Amino acid sequence: FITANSEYSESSSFKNTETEKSMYTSSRYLFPQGRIDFTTPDSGFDDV
Amino acid sequence: GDTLNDVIQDPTRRNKLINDNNLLKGIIMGRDGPVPSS
Q1: Which DSSP letter does residue A9 get?
Q2: A48 vs A46: CA distance, rounded Å
Q3: Alpha helices (runs of H) in B1-38, residue ranges in sequence order
Q4: Residues β-bridged to residue B29
Q5: How near does any CA of chain B get to the CA of A47, in Å?
Q6: Do A37 and B35 touch (CB under 8 A)?
Q7: Residue pairs between chains A and B whose CB atoms are closer than 8 Å
Q8: Backbone phi, psi, residue B14, to 5°
Q9: Are A35 and B38 contacting, i.e. CB atoms less than 8 angstroms apart?
Q10: Considering only alpha carbons, which residue of chain A is nearest residue B19?
């Protein structure tokens, strides 16, 4: 004499992305010409 | 096409070569490495 029905459907979804980037550049141009010296009294040299 | 001969025969060029290369100066062998003497 009677019929009954029930349904229950549940769903879940999840996504997660993490991105990291890093860059570094170092340039050095070294163009020497020479060296200059001064004489300290402890050296004992006549040019002081 | 000059060579070392043309440099050496000219006193100005010969002395420029000697001076710019520290050819009259010894080398200090320090613990940090060799350095030309003044």
Answers
A1: -
A2: 6
A3: 4-9, 11-20
A4: B34
A5: 12
A6: no
A7: 4
A8: -60, -45
A9: yes
A10: A34
